Design a binder for this molecule. Structure first.
Ligand code: CLA
Ligand code: CLA
Ligand code: CLA
Ligand code: CLA
Ligand SMILES: CC1=C(/C=C/C(C)=C/C=C/C(C)=C/C=C/C=C(C)/C=C/C=C(C)/C=C/C2=C(C)CCCC2(C)C)C(C)(C)CCC1
Ligand SMILES: CC1=C(/C=C/C(C)=C/C=C/C(C)=C/C=C/C=C(C)/C=C/C=C(C)/C=C/C2=C(C)CCCC2(C)C)C(C)(C)CCC1
Ligand SMILES: CCCCCCCCCCCCO[C@@H]1O[C@H](CO)[C@@H](O[C@H]2O[C@H](CO)[C@@H](O)[C@H](O)[C@H]2O)[C@H](O)[C@H]1O
Ligand SMILES: CCCCCCCS[C@@H]1O[C@H](CO)[C@@H](O)[C@H](O)[C@H]1O
Lengths: 51, 121
């Protein structure tokens, strides 16, 4: 069957599932941005922009 | 004159009585008689809290805050002696009244600062 390093090649001839995989990637990256910002807000001390 | 039922829930119960623009007169003091403040009312419109910076040499400023305990902040029904002094100064000496309110305000960023807003004694 397909080697582990080729599993995503099933998408090459499948525009709909390629778009779906793209959307998922996009969901992951936007979710990262959101999560990252909240973690930063939960830890950031805004009390001294000087030092 | 409004009744309780006119006032209940409006927020007006936490407001001190006001006077018209026309009240720019003069209340005589006759050093012969004794006087009293029969009602003193104090209504806070702003709470400022002094910041505490990491070094002196920065003059620390008083900054605005957000009140989180609602319309519960006013002092009222306060009374006491209004003395006439030798030099004709007056001295108010508070005896009794609703002369304190606990208050919590919040600094920018959320730190809560409770205080006992008061003119006791
Ligand atoms: C953007 C990321 C992404 C997307 C959109 C896809 C999408 C796809 N994969 Mg691929 N894949 C990925 C990343 C992705 N994969 C990664 C990182 C691996 C290595 C584990 C794989 C390994 C893989 C295999 C072995 C197979 C696919 C297959 C497929 C297809 C069917 C779905 C599936 O079986 O997933 C399976 C993959 C997963 C479920 C990923 C596992 C989740 C990892 C471990 C992250 C855990 C998430 C968790 C919520 C957070 C952990 C936090 C931490 C602090 C512990 C589809 C085209 C299948 C197929 O079509 O092959 C022809 C198939 O057999 N994928
Ligand atoms: C947009 C960027 C992009 C995209 C869409 C692809 C897409 C593809 N690549 Mg290419 N590739 C890329 C960039 C990309 N590549 C880069 C930067 C390199 C050098 C690192 C390569 C080197 C490369 C090789 C050597 C091969 C591919 C192959 C493939 C195909 C199968 C992939 C697969 O099933 O992996 C499945 C992968 C897993 C099941 C697990 C991988 C786990 C990785 C190693 C570590 C963990 C990854 C982690 C989740 C990373 C997320 C962080 C992000 C910033 C990158 C697919 C068409 C294969 C191919 O041509 O098949 C015919 C193939 O042999 N790629
Ligand atoms: C009007 C024509 C049009 C428009 C506006 C777009 C726009 C887009 N296409 Mg392209 N595309 C088109 C024609 C179009 N396409 C045609 C005729 C084909 C051949 C069928 C393609 C084949 C194609 C592929 C294969 C892929 C794209 C992808 C993309 C997206 C890339 C950026 C992204 O994900 O941002 C981030 C997204 C946002 C910030 C959200 C935007 C708001 C969305 C669009 C509203 C959704 C509602 C709408 C009714 C659904 C249909 C949308 C569709 C017209 C794009 C973007 C939304 C990629 C994709 O979708 O990645 C996820 C992708 O893989 N397109
Ligand atoms: C320009 C920005 C950019 C680009 C071009 C990509 C491109 C890629 N991403 Mg995305 N990514 C981005 C930004 C980007 N990412 C951001 C901002 C996030 C939020 C953190 C992610 C989160 C994300 C996740 C969770 C996943 C991807 C995956 C992918 C790959 C999907 C196609 C594939 O099958 O490759 C096949 C894989 C490769 C060719 C290998 C890529 C190797 C990278 C470049 C080096 C890292 C390898 C290193 C050994 C890992 C150590 C990590 C370990 C210590 C935990 C592709 C290489 C998916 C993927 O790798 O699926 C297997 C996947 O699961 N990305
Ligand atoms: C469903 C839904 C929803 C929700 C959503 C959510 C809640 C989401 C989330 C999301 C998220 C929360 C996401 C996250 C993501 C993340 C990620 C994607 C990450 C990744 C990472 C990585 C990739 C890393 C890597 C590395 C390491 C680990 C180490 C060092 C090096 C490196 C960097 C390489 C709502 C309600 C809105 C509505 C609609 C429906
Ligand atoms: C319609 C419907 C529904 C839906 C559902 C859904 C749609 C869900 C979703 C789900 C999801 C989609 C979820 C998510 C998950 C996520 C995760 C699990 C994540 C993780 C992450 C992490 C772990 C992170 C980390 C980090 C970063 C990344 C940066 C910053 C730092 C930190 C560390 C924080 C239901 C069933 C309800 C029912 C009704 C109907
Ligand atoms: C949409 C997904 C769900 C949303 C949930 C994720 C939101 C996370 C980030 C929002 C930022 C608030 O982040 C959080 O703030 C409070 C108040 O400063 C801090 O709370 C900490 O400091 C205050 C001092 O004021 C203490 O009363 C408290 O006991 C202490 O743990 C947390 O250390 C911080 O993590
Ligand atoms: C996705 C919804 C985000 C939830 C927002 C949390 C309130 S906002 C949050 O409030 C804290 C205390 O006032 C501040 O210290 C912190 O700096 C601020 O990020």
């Amino acid at each position: 069957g397909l080697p582990w390093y080729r599993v995503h090649t099933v998408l090459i001839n499948d525009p709909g599932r390629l778009i779906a995989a793209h959307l998922m990637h996009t969901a992951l990256v936007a979710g990262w941005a959101g999560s990252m910002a909240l973690y930063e807000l939960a830890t950031f001390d805004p009390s001294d922009p000087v030092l | 004159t409004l009744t309780y039922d006119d006032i209940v829930g409006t927020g007006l119960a936490n407001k001190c009585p006001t006077l018209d623009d026309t009240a720019r007169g003069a209340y005589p003091i006759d050093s012969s008689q004794t006087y009293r403040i029969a009602r003193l009312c104090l209504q806070p419109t702003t709470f400022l809290v002094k910041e505490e910076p990491k070094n002196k040499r920065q003059e620390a400023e008083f900054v605005p805050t957000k009140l989180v305990t609602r319309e519960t902040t006013s002092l009222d029904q306060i009374q006491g002696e209004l003395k006439v002094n030798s030099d004709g100064s007056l001295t108010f000496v508070e005896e009794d009244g609703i002369d304190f309110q606990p208050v919590t305000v919040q600094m920018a960023g959320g730190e809560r600062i409770p205080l006992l807003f008061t003119v006791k004694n």
